[PDB]
Swiss-Prot record, chain A:
Sequence repeat residues: 67-152, 168-244
Post-translational modification note: In response to oxidative stress, Cys-315 is reversibly oxidized to cysteine sulfenic acid. Oxidation of Cys-315 impairs formation of a ternary complex with TBP and DNA and down-regulates expression of target genes in response to oxidative stress.
Functional note: General activator of RNA polymerase III transcription. Factor exclusively required for RNA polymerase III transcription of genes with promoter elements upstream of the initiation sites. Contributes to the regulation of gene expression; functions as activator in the absence of oxidative stress. Down-regulates expression of target genes in response to oxidative stress. Overexpression protects cells against apoptosis in response to oxidative stress.
Stored Pfam families: BRF2-like_C_cyclin_rpt, Zn_Ribbon_TF
Name under which the protein is recorded: Transcription factor IIIB 50 kDa subunit
Residue numbers spanned by region Interaction with target DNA: 103-109
Localization terms from the record: Nucleus
Stretches for region Required for the formation of a ternary complex with DNA and TBP: 311-317
UniProtKB/Swiss-Prot annotation, chain B:
Keywords: Disease variant, DNA-binding, Host-virus interaction, Neurodegeneration, Nucleus, Repeat, Spinocerebellar ataxia, Transcription, Transcription regulation
Predominant location category: nucleus
Segment of the intact protein contained: 159 to 334 of 339
Illness the protein is tied to: Spinocerebellar ataxia 17: Spinocerebellar ataxia is a clinically and genetically heterogeneous group of cerebellar disorders. Patients show progressive incoordination of gait and often poor coordination of hands, speech and eye movements, due to degeneration of the cerebellum with variable involvement of the brainstem and spinal cord. SCA17 is an autosomal dominant cerebellar ataxia (ADCA) characterized by widespread cerebral and cerebellar atrophy, dementia and extrapyramidal signs. The molecular defect in SCA17 is the expansion of a CAG repeat in the coding region of TBP.
Gene symbol of the encoding locus: TBP
Annotated protein name in UniProt: TATA-box-binding protein
Tissue: Widely expressed, with levels highest in the testis and ovary.
One Gene Ontology CC term in the entry: female germ cell nucleus
GO molecular function, one term: RNA polymerase III general transcription initiation factor activity
Binding-site list for DNA: 9, 45, 60, 99, 136
Swiss-Prot record, chain C:
Disease: Leukodystrophy, hypomyelinating, 8, with or without oligodontia and/or hypogonadotropic hypogonadism: An autosomal recessive neurodegenerative disorder characterized by early childhood onset of cerebellar ataxia and mild intellectual disabilities associated with diffuse hypomyelination apparent on brain MRI. Variable features include oligodontia and/or hypogonadotropic hypogonadism. Charcot-Marie-Tooth disease, demyelinating, type 1I: An autosomal dominant demyelinating form of Charcot-Marie-Tooth disease, a disorder of the peripheral nervous system, characterized by progressive weakness and atrophy, initially of the peroneal muscles and later of the distal muscles of the arms. Charcot-Marie-Tooth disease is classified in two main groups on the basis of electrophysiologic properties and histopathology: primary peripheral demyelinating neuropathies (designated CMT1 when they are dominantly inherited) and primary peripheral axonal neuropathies (CMT2).
Source species: Homo sapiens
Protein name listed in UniProt: DNA-directed RNA polymerase III subunit RPC2
Family recorded in the similarity comment: Belongs to the RNA polymerase beta chain family.
Subcellular localization, as worded in the UniProt entry: Nucleus; Cytoplasm, Cytosol
UniProtKB/Swiss-Prot annotation, chain D:
Protein name: Transcription factor TFIIIB component B'' homolog
Domain of life from the UniProt record: Eukaryota
PTM note: Phosphorylated by CSNK2A1 during mitosis, resulting in its release from chromatin and suppression of polymerase III transcription.
Reported induction: By Epstein-Barr virus (EBV) resulting in the stimulation of the EBV EBER genes.
Location relative to the cell: Nucleus
Subunit: Component of TFIIIB complex. The TFIIIB complex has two activities, alpha and beta. The TFIIIB-alpha and TFIIIB-beta activities are required for transcription of genes with TFIIIC-bound internal promoters and PSE transcription factor-bound external promoters, respectively. The TFIIIB-alpha activity complex is composed of TBP, BDP1, and a complex containing both BRF2 and at least four stably associated proteins; YY1 facilitates the formation of TFIIIB-alpha activity complex. The TFIIIB-beta activity complex is composed of TBP, BDP1, and BRF1.
Residue ranges of domain Myb-like in the record: 22-72
Record's disease association: Deafness, autosomal recessive, 112: A form of non-syndromic, sensorineural deafness characterized by postlingual progressive hearing impairment. Sensorineural deafness results from damage to the neural receptors of the inner ear, the nerve pathways to the brain, or the area of the brain that receives sound information.
Tissues where the protein occurs: Isoform 2 is highly expressed in cerebellum.
Membrane-spanning ranges: none
Length: 361, 176, 49, 111
């Protein structure tokens, strides 16, 4: 403030290579000159963190060191930026604060590292399936999932939803159909951008038609890219199958994917019946792929007409006439005891006891 | 909401106030199983209410499979009578309902992504592992398994009124 | 020019096919990243040539 | 150093892997007469899973447990009917019936 008049309108203005505080009313300065570090001394001085100037980073067990080095190599083999490494090691140090977590086996620490890098990639919109992570872990996926559920129940951190478009972008590029390598004939080669756009449209169609809820995404993505590859050239690709396509692409095909494919084909049929030329053509499960592009041209009205006539698992679509049958009200318990012969029926006779002892003698 | 949930499983424990010999009750009973190599407790199954109980040597016993609190009490009294018939001073003391699991249905599909987008801090949706969304409401501390089929499973309550209020509170969230 | 604007390196990833043993079973590979070599401009692999 | 003992195998080329997350435990199927003999063994011994597993060399304990649970869930009426009727413990004729079931399943595999 101003020492004489008391005006608190002090403004920082850059003078001729000089910093100072001055009031705009009387032009009087209250504090002039500023002390800044020189780069000549900045390169000499070594930085110290509060993680080291407090005694911490020395109480790091050999197991905690192994865990953090595992986090480092896991985020490095994925070719992740150093920001992902920092966030992952921060999450690991935060999760290691619990007594129940620090006292565990090597499998537990490894699946914890896997879940930590999974959460790290989930944070910054980086899609990565749990299968690709479990592939780099020396453990099974069931215990990995159990520990994941346990730690997300114990911590309750933010878990974004897996985006389908980014997952398609990550999954379509893994195929070798884009390059005309000698292992694949030139007839199967296609453009990456067109196939990616077709697969994105097909997975959007699956999303709006209840084909991403509950079921694993990867089989739906495989079915979508297979339909896209078939529609790009049904002249020389309709005769193939999903197994042939997966063998040619050198990618392990999902088991339910074919079934998912069938469902998607059914959806296509439910669209082809709405279009006049297609409903006159009288297509089938095989000849519907060639018009998939047309189905993707006006997919909105087609799915609206299909839904105005929802999607559910086939187990419940068998016309259930009895939905949630009401059980009979039998909450009675008699007066004190309904009967006593049940005990006589449940007890073992001496002959039965002797037979049991003789059977496993 | 016009829909009433249906309780399916009841879990309740009871102390007998006395020590038991597991080999004696396992040797003189036909519906009793005891394999100390893996599990050191006695498994018994009563048929009329269709329920299963676990008996421990420390005097504690637990029941599962009941539909209501009265059926669980009846099963506990039946097991107490069975234990008393084998020459043991079993008592029916400290009986309290521990957990209840029920099922219901809404008859319309549910978007499991809109829920996790609007109620992220109350649910943990992972379709890659389990198809059903897991919702954890903290005010009654109820865990709900939701499916695209619309049928919802509720657990974690202590009384039927808790299940009813949890369902009537989660119904507008599912409808919206 | 995009690498000049985005302040990032202009490199190409190295692919490698190898063979090894996990449980005394010969497991082979086809394409595995091991690093990135910076690509000099107007070289054989450069797009400008 | 072995001499021509192992063959090269291509596995896991480090691409995007499908998330299986499933362990389909192999379970031997159940036949009609096998179900009948399991029911009679239950009626003769009770609900002792250990004793049933001991006298079932062709089956497993967890398989017997799953079958018993499925039966209690689906055919509780037949379960109670079998539990009401009693039959003394047989050993020699039980082994004869086991040999008969072995011959029957061998003939079935021959078909
Ligand atoms: Zn002044």
């Amino acid at each position: 403030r101003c020492p004489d008049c008391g005006s608190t309108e002090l403004v920082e203005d850059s003078h001729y290579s000089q910093s100072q505080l001055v009031c705009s009313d009387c032009g009087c300065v209250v504090t002039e000159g500023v002390l800044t570090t020189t780069f000549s001394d900045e390169g000499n001085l070594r930085e110290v963190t509060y993680s080291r100037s407090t005694g911490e980073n020395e109480q790091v067990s050999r197991s905690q060191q192994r865990g953090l080095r595992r986090v480092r190599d896991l985020c490095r083999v994925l070719q992740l930026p150093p920001t992902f490494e920092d966030t992952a090691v921060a999450y690991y140090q935060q999760a290691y604060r619990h007594s129940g977590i620090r006292a565990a086996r090597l499998q537990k620490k490894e699946v914890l590292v896997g879940c930590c890098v999974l959460i790290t990639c989930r944070q910054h919109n980086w899609p990565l399936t749990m299968g690709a992570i479990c592939t780099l872990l020396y453990a099974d996926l069931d215990v990995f999932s159990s520990t994941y559920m346990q730690i997300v129940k114990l911590l309750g951190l933010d878990v974004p939803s897996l985006c389908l478009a980014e997952l398609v972008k990550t999954y379509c590029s893994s195929f070798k159909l884009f390059q005309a390598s000698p292992s694949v004939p030139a007839k199967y080669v296609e453009d990456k951008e067109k196939m990616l756009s077709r697969t994105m449209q097909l997975v959007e169609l699956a999303n709006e038609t209840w084909l991403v809820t509950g079921r694993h995404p990867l089989p739906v993505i495989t079915a979508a890219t297979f339909l896209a590859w078939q529609s790009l050239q049904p002249a020389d690709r309709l005769s193939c199958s999903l197994a042939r396509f997966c063998k040619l692409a050198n990618v392990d095909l999902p088991y339910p994917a074919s079934s998912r494919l069938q469902e998607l084909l059914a959806v296509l049929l439910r669209m082809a019946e709405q279009l006049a030329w297609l409903r006159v053509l009288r297509l089938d499960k095989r000849s519907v792929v060639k018009h998939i592009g047309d189905l993707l041209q006006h997919r909105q009205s087609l799915v609206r007409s299909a839904f105005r006539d929802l999607l559910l698992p086939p187990c419940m679509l068998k016309s259930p006439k009895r939905i949630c049958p009401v059980p009979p009200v039998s909450t009675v318990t008699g007066d004190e005891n309904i009967s006593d012969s049940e005990i006589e029926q449940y007890l073992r006779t001496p002959q039965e006891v002797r037979d049991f002892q003789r059977a496993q003698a | 909401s016009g829909i009433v949930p249906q309780l399916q499983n009841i879990v309740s424990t009871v102390n007998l106030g006395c020590k038991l010999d597991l080999k004696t009750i396992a040797l003189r009973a036909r519906n009793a199983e005891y394999n100390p190599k893996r599990f050191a407790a006695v498994i018994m199954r009563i048929r009329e209410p269709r329920t299963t109980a676990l008996i421990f040597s420390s005097g504690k016993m637990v029941c599962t499979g009941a539909k209501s609190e009265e059926q669980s009490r009846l099963a506990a009294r039946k097991y107490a009578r069975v234990v008393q018939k084998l020459g043991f001073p079993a008592k029916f003391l400290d009986f309290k309902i521990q957990n209840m699991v029920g099922s219901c249905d809404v008859k319309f599909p549910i978007r499991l992504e809109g829920l996790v987008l609007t109620h992220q801090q109350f649910s943990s949706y992972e379709p890659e592992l389990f198809p059903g969304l897991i919702y954890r409401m903290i005010k009654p501390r109820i865990v709900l398994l939701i499916f695209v089929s619309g049928k919802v499973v509720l657990t974690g309550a202590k009384v039927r009124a808790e299940i009813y209020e949890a369902f009537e509170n989660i119904y507008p969230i599912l409808k919206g | 020019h995009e690498c000049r604007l985005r302040d990032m390196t202009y490199s190409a990833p190295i692919t490698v096919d190898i063979e090894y043993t996990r449980g005394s079973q010969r497991i082979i590979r086809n394409a595995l990243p091991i690093g990135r070599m910076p690509i000099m401009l107007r070289s054989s692999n450069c797009v400008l040539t | 150093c072995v001499v021509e003992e192992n063959d090269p195998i291509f596995e896991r080329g480090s691409t995007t892997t499908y998330s299986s997350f499933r362990k389909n435990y192999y379970s031997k199927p159940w036949s009609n007469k096998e179900t009948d003999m399991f029911f009679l063994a239950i009626s003769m011994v009770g609900t002792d899973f250990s004793m049933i597993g001991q006298l079932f060399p062709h089956r497993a304990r967890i398989e017997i447990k799953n079958k018993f649970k499925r039966e209690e869930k689906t055919n509780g009426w037949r379960i109670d009917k079998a539990f009401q009727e009693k039959r003394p413990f047989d050993f020699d004729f039980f082994a004869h019936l086991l040999q008969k079931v072995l011959a029957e399943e061998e003939k079935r595999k021959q078909k």
